[PDB]
């Protein structure tokens, strides 16, 4: 019971690490998309104003 | 760098060729001197393997751990290995065969144990991260029959108390002056796979009084002889494997010297022609 309790705690920490990394990477995924939206909006706006 | 440096590089390769040639002869002296020790140890060990060729036969056997079999859960290996490098692919071609067998037992969950003789065995199996129950190193040119026994003091006590259910010896073997074979074989339980002495079955044996002591002490000399002869025949294999490998280096060094000299003779001729053009074209 002492050994399996620490086994449960270590698999919980492994899950917690997994959770930690994924959350960071969805944030990282989000970061890339937003900056691409900003770059796309700026280039469209800029190109039509210079034509104007 | 330039020709001054390249000329200095060639001199270091020429130095290397000599030294790797001297230690080719010195090795070949040791491999003949150690072959005499092997050839003198061989008849005694050959008799011991005939003696157990008897002890495997008969129905007059008493009870005795080393002689009788056992249901197997934990197995031990004695691995002999070098104190010295440069032997080439000797140690690792032995150790992969050991690990293949060790993995084979470890496949079914049978436990395993190692005892090592020699520096390179300790390091490799510590790197793989196996067990090591006992160790000895610094055997040099030739160890004494008493000074290597630490590894067998544990491994014999382990098979006695049922800490072990099999015990093996693991070495290269000197089958030719320029070829040697890695081998693994079992000492305990003294394998009943060996023949019964059926030609002499009519002569079924009578113990002398105190048969426990006479049988135990005799078998201690058997395992002592098998381990020591295996060490000595591995030491003949190392000095032979070194000479073969040192011979190749001397040749490979020779190739490197001719190549480099052809490069230098170009660099020399170019530097003469290049600067002389700068001089003559400077008369303007």
């Amino acid at each position: 019971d002492l050994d399996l309790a620490k086994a449960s705690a270590t698999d919980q920490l492994k899950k917690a690490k997994a959770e930690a990394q994924v959350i960071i990477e969805q944030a990282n995924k989000r970061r890339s998309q937003i900056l691409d939206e900003a770059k796309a909006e700026a280039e469209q706006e800029r190109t039509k104003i210079v034509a104007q | 760098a330039g020709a001054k440096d390249i000329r200095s590089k060639i001199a270091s390769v020429q130095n290397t060729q000599k030294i790797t040639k001297a230690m080719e002869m010195v090795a070949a002296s040791k491999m003949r001197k150690s072959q005499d020790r092997m050839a003198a140890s061989r008849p005694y060990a050959e008799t011991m393997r005939k003696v157990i060729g008897h002890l495997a036969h008969g129905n007059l056997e008493y009870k005795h751990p080393y002689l009788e079999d056992r249901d197997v859960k934990r197995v031990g290996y004695l691995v002999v290995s070098t104190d010295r490098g440069l032997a080439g692919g000797l140690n690792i071609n032995l150790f992969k065969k050991l690990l293949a067998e060790m993995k084979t037992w470890t496949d079914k969950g049978v436990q395993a144990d190692l005892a090592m003789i020699g520096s390179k065995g300790v390091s490799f199996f510590n790197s793989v991260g196996g067990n090591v129950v006992a160790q000895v190193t610094g055997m040099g040119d030739n160890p004494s029959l008493s000074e290597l026994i630490g590894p067998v003091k544990v491994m014999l006590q382990a098979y006695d108390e049922g800490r072990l259910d099999k015990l093996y010896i693991v070495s290269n073997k000197f089958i030719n002056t320029m070829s040697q074979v890695p081998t693994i074989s079992q000492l305990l339980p003294l394998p009943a796979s060996d023949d019964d002495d059926l030609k002499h079955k009519s002569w079924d044996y009578l113990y002398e009084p105190d048969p426990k002591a006479l049988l135990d002490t005799l078998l201690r000399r058997y395992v002592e002889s098998q381990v020591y002869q295996g060490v000595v025949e591995n030491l003949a294999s190392e000095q032979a494997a070194r000479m073969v490998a040192m011979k190749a280096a001397t040749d490979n060094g020779g190739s490197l010297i001719k190549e480099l000299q052809l490069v230098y003779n170009k660099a020399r001729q170019a530097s003469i022609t290049q600067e002389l053009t700068e001089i003559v074209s400077g008369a303007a």
Partner: protein, 342 residues
């Protein structure tokens, strides 16, 4: 293709807020390469602080040759009014090739390697213009308009070697003149050590007098230790037993070698560099596994920027170092290494 230009335009980019004006002189480059570097200067904030002086590969051999001097004349205007300028002469070697063309077409006698003999006088008079002038010289030049200010011009010339061969005539001249060199080399660059700075043959002749005290204190240990690590690693290469002093040194040296790698266009402030060196010179790296050392650094910079920014401002503004600074950095490393993850 070892990162010679990358280093020099990152040195320009990082001046965006230091107050130092920049000049980039392009001798003999192709015009689209200039247009690309000017674009990167414009993606960052760096172009507004920079003059770009150009003589492309199409232009006559006299437009080149004369370009470095045209750039220096612009840098001197700031130098003689108590302002700092940083001038990057790119491919001073190509300036020498253009000057050899002119000299041979004028039938002047060739010297070694077919360059004219005065080619040392060409570069030495160019490079001795970069100088720090005392306040009196500024006051005299400005006729009392500016008083009490010392002006400076800093030069970063670039030379290309053909095969690491430093013995060529143009490299030997320019190595003679300058206050140091940074050697970048192909073996390190292919191994992934980028920037590929060889610690052994690189040297600064000004040294610690140029640093802030915090960097001065930490970095003095780094460079000579790292050079001896490379000697020790060779002598080690077939030694199996490694004594603990040696084992520690080879370990520390691999971890410092890994720590000094850095991505392009990603410059680090003083406080960031100081904190990361403090991690190495106080052994907080020592237990950390080597590929994680890269992630360790990124996580440490992130952690300190959210939690401990008042100290970063203190260090960046002052450059100061004291027992409370060592204590606060010790506390930050102890706290990070317990609480966070790499």
């Amino acid at each position: 293709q070892t990162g010679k230009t990358a280093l020099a335009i990152d040195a320009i980019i990082n001046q965006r807020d230091s107050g130092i004006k920049a000049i980039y002189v392009a001798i003999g480059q192709k015009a689209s390469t200039i247009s690309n570097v000017v674009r990167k200067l414009e993606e960052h904030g760096a172009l507004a602080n920079t003059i770009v002086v150009v003589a492309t590969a199409s232009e006559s051999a006299a437009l080149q040759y004369l370009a470095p001097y045209a750039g220096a004349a612009m840098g001197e205007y700031f130098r003689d009014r108590g302002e700092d300028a940083l001038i990057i002469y790119d491919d001073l070697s190509k300036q020498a090739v253009a000057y050899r063309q002119i000299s041979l077409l004028l039938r002047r006698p060739p010297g070694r390697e077919a360059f004219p003999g005065d080619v040392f006088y060409l570069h030495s008079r160019l490079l001795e213009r970069a100088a720090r002038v005392n306040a009196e010289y500024v006051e005299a030049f400005t006729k009392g308009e500016v008083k009490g200010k010392t002006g400076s011009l800093t030069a970063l010339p670039i030379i290309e070697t053909q095969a690491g061969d430093v013995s060529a005539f143009v490299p030997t001249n320019v190595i003679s003149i300058t206050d140091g060199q940074i050697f970048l080399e192909t073996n390190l660059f292919n191994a992934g050590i980028r920037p590929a700075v060889n610690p052994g043959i690189s040297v600064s002749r000004v040294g610690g007098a140029a640093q802030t005290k915090i960097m001065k204190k930490l970095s003095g240990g780094i460079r000579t230790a790292l050079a001896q690590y490379r000697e020790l690693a060779a002598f080690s290469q077939f030694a199996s037993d490694l004594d603990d002093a040696t084992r520690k040194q080879l370990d520390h040296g691999q971890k410092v070698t890994e720590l000094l790698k850095q991505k392009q266009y990603a410059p680090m402030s003083v406080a960031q560099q100081s904190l990361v060196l403090f991690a190495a010179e106080r052994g907080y790296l020592a237990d950390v596994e080597l590929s994680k050392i890269g992630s360790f650094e990124a996580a440490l910079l992130a952690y300190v920027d959210r939690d401990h920014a008042p100290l970063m401002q203190e260090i960046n503004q002052t450059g100061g170092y004291n027992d409370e600074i060592e204590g606060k950095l010790k506390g930050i490393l102890d706290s990070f290494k317990a609480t966070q993850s790499w």
